[PDB]
């Protein structure tokens, strides 16, 4: 049961530093070479750094002085990547990967840890319920949730704490004048709303914001 679990990512200003960790389990960590790989927002994959059993035998795609440092603590079964003098274009999902043997071939990938390099401040979202237009007629009804003005990504959004997943469409977040906006729609049969409550659950961990917004009919 090979497991690689990254952590340490987050938001950082350009010029700052960030240390990522990869907790390994399920294999003899000290006998395998390891690499870090990153995926950019454009979904491009790119090698970052590579380390063998030794602490000095490290190789980097960009060896500009003191920008990437890969290290490992074999007693803690952990791999590290120190990012320094961060640039905006270092924004990416960083993956821990295990080499199968003596070559550069990969077998297992981690789950990734998201790094955002930006000058913008963390900002909590506003959550707005979208109820149908004043009126009320049809076999089904479509409701919505608009999450506006937050930074950085991501927000998570569920309906009725996850128990309502059929008929749900969530639209990817888009940057609009420095801040993200996301929305979600849910379609249910007309006889269940508003007789049964429908609630939008929005979480923004970077600002610790958690909102549960009930959708209620418009008035008058």
């Amino acid at each position: 049961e090979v497991q690689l679990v990254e952590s340490g990512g987050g938001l950082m200003r350009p010029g700052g530093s960030l240390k990522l960790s990869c907790a390994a389990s399920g294999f003899a960590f000290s006998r395998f070479d390891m690499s870090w790989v990153r995926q950019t927002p454009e979904k491009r994959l790119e090698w970052v750094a590579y380390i063998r059993n030794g602490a000095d035998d490290t190789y980097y795609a960009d060896t500009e002085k003191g920008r990437f440092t890969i290290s490992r603590d074999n007693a803690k079964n952990t791999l590290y990547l120190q990012l320094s003098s961060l640039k905006i274009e270092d924004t990416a999902m960083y993956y821990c990967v295990r080499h199968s043997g003596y070559s550069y071939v990969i077998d297992y990938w981690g789950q990734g840890t998201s790094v955002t390099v930006s000058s913008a401040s963390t900002t909590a979202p506003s959550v707005y319920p979208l109820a149908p237009v004043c009126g009320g007629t049809g076999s089904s009804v479509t409701l919505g949730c608009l999450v506006k003005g937050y930074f950085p990504e991501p927000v998570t959004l569920t309906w009725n704490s996850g128990s309502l997943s059929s008929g749900v469409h969530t639209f990817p977040a888009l940057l609009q004048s420095g801040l993200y906006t996301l929305s979600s729609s849910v379609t249910v049969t007309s006889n269940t709303w508003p007789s049964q409550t429908i609630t939008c659950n929005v979480a923004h961990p970077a600002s610790s914001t958690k909102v549960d917004k009930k959708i209620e009919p418009r008035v008058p």
Binding site: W109, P132, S185, R218
Partner: protein, 212 residues
């Protein structure tokens, strides 16, 4: 670094169909080559190594071939779980380099969108802003145009359009269109209209409301 050129960049395929991706390296890489699959929302998974060897647990419908500079991945009988993005990788020379990816999606019959329009919520109006939202649900193919009209005149400034990826249950797309106004501007007009044009019909689908 060695350049990896993957083709095509995307393709639609039917269930049970045979599909082939190719990748070309800028020099001989002696079969130090792998294929990866990235299902939607997940990290990549290694499918093939050494050009033609299957990773344990990968079904036999996947197969790789090639040598020198030219390599291929073939999926013999396409299944629903095979959708996602496929990447090639050379690891003959450091640093290993990935191809740009091939996005594989499901072909299905055309479907017209279901359109819904939402005035600004009362909570937003208290804040000083006003967003009008149009949802276009469950259409195929992906291309679609949305037009906003305010008291009859077209408005394009301030529109944000967001598509989903392909639906995992019915292979349709949905999209959200948000027109963002100031509260002052929203209150200067009465009728708001979202018009969706899609290849399934020459006439647009129209949804409107009046501020009353």
């Amino acid at each position: 670094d060695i350049k990896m050129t993957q083709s095509p960049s995307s393709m639609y395929a039917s269930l049970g169909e045979r599909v082939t991706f190719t990748c070309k390296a800028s020099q001989d890489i002696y079969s130090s080559f792998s294929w990866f699959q990235q299902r939607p929302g997940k990290s990549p998974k290694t499918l093939i190594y050494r050009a033609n060897r299957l990773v344990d647990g990968v079904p036999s419908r996947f197969s790789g071939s090639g040598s020198g500079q030219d390599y291929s991945l073939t999926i013999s009988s396409l299944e629903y779980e095979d959708m996602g993005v496929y990447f090639c990788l050379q690891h003959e020379e450091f640093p290993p380099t990935f191809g740009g990816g091939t996005k594989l999606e499901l072909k299905r019959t055309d479907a017209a969108p279901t359109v819904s329009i939402f005035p600004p919520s009362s909570e937003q109006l208290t804040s000083g802003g006003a967003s009008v939202v149009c949802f276009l649900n469950n259409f195929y193919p992906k291309d679609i145009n949305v037009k906003w009209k305010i008291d009859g005149s077209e408005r394009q400034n301030g529109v944000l359009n967001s598509w989903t990826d392909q639906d995992s249950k019915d292979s349709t797309y949905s999209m959200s269109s948000t027109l963002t106004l100031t509260k002052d501007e929203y209150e200067r007009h009465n009728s708001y209209t979202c018009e969706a044009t899609h290849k399934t019909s020459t006439s647009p689908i129209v949804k409107s409301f009046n501020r009353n």
